[PDB]
mmCIF file of C-alpha atoms and ligand atoms in Angstrom:
data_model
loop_
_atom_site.group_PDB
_atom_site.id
_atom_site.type_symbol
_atom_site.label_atom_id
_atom_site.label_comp_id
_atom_site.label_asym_id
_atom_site.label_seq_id
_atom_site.Cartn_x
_atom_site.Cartn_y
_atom_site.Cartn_z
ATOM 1 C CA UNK E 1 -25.482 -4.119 28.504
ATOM 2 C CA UNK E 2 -24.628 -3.821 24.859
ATOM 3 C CA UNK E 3 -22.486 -4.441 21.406
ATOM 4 C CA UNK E 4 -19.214 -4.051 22.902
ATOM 5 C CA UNK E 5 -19.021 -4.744 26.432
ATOM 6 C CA UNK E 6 -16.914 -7.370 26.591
ATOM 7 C CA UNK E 7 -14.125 -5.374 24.888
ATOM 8 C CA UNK E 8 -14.533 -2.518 27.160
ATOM 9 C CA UNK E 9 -11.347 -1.685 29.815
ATOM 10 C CA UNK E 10 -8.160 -1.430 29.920
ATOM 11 C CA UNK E 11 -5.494 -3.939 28.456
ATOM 12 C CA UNK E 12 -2.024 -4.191 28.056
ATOM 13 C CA UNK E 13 -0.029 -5.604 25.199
ATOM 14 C CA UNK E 14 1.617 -8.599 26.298
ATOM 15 C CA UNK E 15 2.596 -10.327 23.194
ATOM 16 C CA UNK E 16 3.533 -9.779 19.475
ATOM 17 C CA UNK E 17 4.503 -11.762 16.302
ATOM 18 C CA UNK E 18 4.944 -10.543 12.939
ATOM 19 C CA UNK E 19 4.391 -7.035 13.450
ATOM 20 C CA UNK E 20 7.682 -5.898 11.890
ATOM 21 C CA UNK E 21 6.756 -7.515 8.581
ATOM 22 C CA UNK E 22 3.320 -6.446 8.833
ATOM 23 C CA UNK E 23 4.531 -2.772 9.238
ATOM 24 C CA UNK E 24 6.616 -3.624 6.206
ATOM 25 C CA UNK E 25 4.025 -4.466 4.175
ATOM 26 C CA UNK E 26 2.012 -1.611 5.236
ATOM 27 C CA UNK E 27 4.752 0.302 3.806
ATOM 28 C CA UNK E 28 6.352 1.796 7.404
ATOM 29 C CA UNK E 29 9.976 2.818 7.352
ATOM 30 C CA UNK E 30 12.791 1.470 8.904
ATOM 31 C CA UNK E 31 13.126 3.491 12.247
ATOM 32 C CA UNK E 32 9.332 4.137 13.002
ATOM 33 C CA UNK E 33 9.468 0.344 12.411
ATOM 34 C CA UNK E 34 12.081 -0.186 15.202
ATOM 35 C CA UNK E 35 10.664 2.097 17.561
ATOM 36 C CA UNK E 36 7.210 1.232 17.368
ATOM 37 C CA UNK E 37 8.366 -2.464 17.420
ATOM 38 C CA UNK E 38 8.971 -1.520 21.107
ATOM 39 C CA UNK E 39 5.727 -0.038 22.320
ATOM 40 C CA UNK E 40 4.209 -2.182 24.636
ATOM 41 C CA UNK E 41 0.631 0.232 24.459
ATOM 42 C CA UNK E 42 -2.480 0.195 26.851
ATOM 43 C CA UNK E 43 -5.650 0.143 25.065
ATOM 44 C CA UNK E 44 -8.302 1.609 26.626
ATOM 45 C CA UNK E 45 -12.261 0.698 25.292
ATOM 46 C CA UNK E 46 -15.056 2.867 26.359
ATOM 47 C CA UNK E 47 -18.253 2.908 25.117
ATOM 48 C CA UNK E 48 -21.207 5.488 25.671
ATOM 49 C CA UNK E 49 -24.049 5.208 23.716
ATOM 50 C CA UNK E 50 -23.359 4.165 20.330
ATOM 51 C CA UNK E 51 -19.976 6.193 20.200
ATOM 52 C CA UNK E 52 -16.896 3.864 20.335
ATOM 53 C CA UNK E 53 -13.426 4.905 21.660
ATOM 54 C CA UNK E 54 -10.725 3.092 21.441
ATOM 55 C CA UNK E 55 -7.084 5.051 23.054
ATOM 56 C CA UNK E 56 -3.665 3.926 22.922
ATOM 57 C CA UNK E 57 -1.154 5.286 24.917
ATOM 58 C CA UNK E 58 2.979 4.462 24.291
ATOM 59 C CA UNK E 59 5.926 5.620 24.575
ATOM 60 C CA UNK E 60 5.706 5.435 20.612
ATOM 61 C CA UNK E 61 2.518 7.334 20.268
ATOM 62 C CA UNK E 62 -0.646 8.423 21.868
ATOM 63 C CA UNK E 63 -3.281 7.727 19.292
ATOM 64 C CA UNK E 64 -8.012 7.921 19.766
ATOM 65 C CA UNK E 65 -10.476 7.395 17.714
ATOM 66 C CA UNK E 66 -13.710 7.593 17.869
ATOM 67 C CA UNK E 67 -16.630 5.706 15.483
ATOM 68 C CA UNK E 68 -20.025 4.488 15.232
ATOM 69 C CA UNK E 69 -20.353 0.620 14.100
ATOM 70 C CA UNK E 70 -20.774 0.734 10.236
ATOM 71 C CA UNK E 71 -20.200 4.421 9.750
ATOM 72 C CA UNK E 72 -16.766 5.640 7.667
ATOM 73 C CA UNK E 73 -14.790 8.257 9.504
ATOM 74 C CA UNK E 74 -11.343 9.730 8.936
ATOM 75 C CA UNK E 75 -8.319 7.998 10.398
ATOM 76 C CA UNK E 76 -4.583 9.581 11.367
ATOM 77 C CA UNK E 77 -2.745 6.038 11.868
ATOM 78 C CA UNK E 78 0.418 6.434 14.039
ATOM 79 C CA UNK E 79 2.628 5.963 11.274
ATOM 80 C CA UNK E 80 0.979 8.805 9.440
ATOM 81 C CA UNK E 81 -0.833 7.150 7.059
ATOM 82 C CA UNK E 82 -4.409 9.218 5.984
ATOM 83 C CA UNK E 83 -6.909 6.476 5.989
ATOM 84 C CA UNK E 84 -10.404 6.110 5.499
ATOM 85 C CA UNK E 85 -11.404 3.567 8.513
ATOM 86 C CA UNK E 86 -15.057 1.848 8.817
ATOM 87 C CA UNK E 87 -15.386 -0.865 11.884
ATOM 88 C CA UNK E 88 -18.119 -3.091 12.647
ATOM 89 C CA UNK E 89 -19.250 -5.991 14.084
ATOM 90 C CA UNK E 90 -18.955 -9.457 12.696
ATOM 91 C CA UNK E 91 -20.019 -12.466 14.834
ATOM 92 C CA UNK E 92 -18.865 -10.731 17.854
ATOM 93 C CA UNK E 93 -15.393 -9.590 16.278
ATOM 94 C CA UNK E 94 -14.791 -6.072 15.918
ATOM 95 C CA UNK E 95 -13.647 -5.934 12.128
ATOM 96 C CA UNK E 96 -11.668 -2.318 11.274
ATOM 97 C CA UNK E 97 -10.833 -1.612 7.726
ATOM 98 C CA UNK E 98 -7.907 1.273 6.750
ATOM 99 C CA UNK E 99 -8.234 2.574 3.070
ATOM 100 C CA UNK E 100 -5.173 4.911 1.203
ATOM 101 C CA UNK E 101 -3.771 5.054 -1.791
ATOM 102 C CA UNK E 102 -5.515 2.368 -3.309
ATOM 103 C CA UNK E 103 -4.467 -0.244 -0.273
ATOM 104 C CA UNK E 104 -6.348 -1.767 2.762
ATOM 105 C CA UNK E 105 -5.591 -3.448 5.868
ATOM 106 C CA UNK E 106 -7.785 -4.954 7.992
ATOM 107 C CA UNK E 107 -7.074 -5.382 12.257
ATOM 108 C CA UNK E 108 -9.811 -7.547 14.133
ATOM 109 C CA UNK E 109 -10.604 -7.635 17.467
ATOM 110 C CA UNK E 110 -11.691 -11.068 19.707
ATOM 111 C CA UNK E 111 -12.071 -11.663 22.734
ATOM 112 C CA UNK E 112 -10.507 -14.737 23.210
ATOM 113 C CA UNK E 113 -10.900 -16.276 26.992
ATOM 114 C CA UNK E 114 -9.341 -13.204 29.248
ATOM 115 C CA UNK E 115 -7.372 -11.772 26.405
ATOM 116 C CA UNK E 116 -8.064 -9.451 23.688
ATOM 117 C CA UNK E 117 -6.644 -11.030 20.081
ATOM 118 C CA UNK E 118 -5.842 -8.669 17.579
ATOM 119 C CA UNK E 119 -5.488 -9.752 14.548
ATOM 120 C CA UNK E 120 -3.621 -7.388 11.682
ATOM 121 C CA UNK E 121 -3.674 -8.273 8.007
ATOM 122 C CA UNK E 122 -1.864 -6.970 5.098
ATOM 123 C CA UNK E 123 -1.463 -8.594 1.674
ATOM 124 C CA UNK E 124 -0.339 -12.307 2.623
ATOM 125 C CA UNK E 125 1.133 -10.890 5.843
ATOM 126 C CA UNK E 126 -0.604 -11.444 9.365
ATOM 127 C CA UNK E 127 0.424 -10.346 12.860
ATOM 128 C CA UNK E 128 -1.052 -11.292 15.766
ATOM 129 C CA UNK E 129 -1.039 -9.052 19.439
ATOM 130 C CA UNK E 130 -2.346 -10.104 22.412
ATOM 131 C CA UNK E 131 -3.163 -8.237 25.210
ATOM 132 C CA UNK E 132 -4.009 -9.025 28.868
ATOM 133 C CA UNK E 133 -6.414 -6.651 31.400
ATOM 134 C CA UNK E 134 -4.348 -3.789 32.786
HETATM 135 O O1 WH3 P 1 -3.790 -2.743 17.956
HETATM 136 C C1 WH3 P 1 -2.635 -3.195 17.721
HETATM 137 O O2 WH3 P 1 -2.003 -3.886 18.557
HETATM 138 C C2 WH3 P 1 -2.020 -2.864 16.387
HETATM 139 C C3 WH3 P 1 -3.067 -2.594 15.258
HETATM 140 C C4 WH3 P 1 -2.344 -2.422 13.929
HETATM 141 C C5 WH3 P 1 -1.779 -1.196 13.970
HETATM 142 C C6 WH3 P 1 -2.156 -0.686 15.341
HETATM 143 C C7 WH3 P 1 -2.069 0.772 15.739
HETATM 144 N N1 WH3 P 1 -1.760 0.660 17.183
HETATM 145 C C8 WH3 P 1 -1.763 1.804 18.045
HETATM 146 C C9 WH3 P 1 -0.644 2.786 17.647
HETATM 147 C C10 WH3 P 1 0.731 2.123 17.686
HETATM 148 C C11 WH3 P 1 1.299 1.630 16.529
HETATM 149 C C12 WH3 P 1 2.470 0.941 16.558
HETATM 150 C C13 WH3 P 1 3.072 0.642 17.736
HETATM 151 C C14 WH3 P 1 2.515 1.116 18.900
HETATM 152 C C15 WH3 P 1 1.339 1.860 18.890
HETATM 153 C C16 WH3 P 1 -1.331 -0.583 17.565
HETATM 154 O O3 WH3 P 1 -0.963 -0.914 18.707
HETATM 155 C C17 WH3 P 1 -1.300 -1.484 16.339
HETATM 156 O O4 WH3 P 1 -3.435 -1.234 15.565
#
């Protein structure tokens, strides 16, 4: 057993405040803002070795990456943003930073009882999304 195997499955977004304004401040448009407002995705979390994946599937958008803890790698975000991403590990929290254009956001990760918390940050503005097992 290893780094992230408590994150590992499948989960389903259940729950989700702020995200509009986050998307906002992230500097999404108005109708990819609408639409992916509705998305209710399933995250999937695999691990093999030290290799990472974390999928997405929507309606909105299917969207994987792939990443080693620590190491920088190149990020398509589903609102089409080219980011530079690095994730690791903090205290058990998977921390994931997005670089463009001279801006950052940060998304963490918790497990938090049987959910998975995540956590999206942008200037002043937070959202919070919660998702259950699938
Ligand atoms: O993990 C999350 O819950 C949040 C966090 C911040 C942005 C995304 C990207 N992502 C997958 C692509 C997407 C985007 C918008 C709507 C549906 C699907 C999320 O679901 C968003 O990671």
């Amino acid at each position: 057993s290893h780094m992230c195997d408590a994150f590992v499955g499948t989960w389903k977004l259940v729950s989700s405040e702020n995200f509009d304004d986050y998307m906002k401040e992230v500097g999404v448009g108005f109708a990819t803002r609408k639409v992916a407002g509705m998305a209710k995705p399933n995250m999937i979390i695999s691990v093999n070795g030290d290799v990472i994946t974390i999928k997405s599937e929507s309606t909105f958008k299917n969207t994987e990456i792939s990443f080693i803890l620590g190491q920088e790698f190149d990020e398509v975000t589903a609102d089409d943003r080219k980011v530079k991403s690095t994730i690791t590990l903090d205290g058990g929290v998977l921390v994931h930073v997005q670089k463009w254009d001279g801006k950052s956001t940060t998304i963490k990760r918790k497990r938090e009882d049987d959910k998975l918390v995540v956590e999206c940050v942008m200037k002043g503005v937070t959202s919070t999304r919660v998702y259950e097992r699938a």
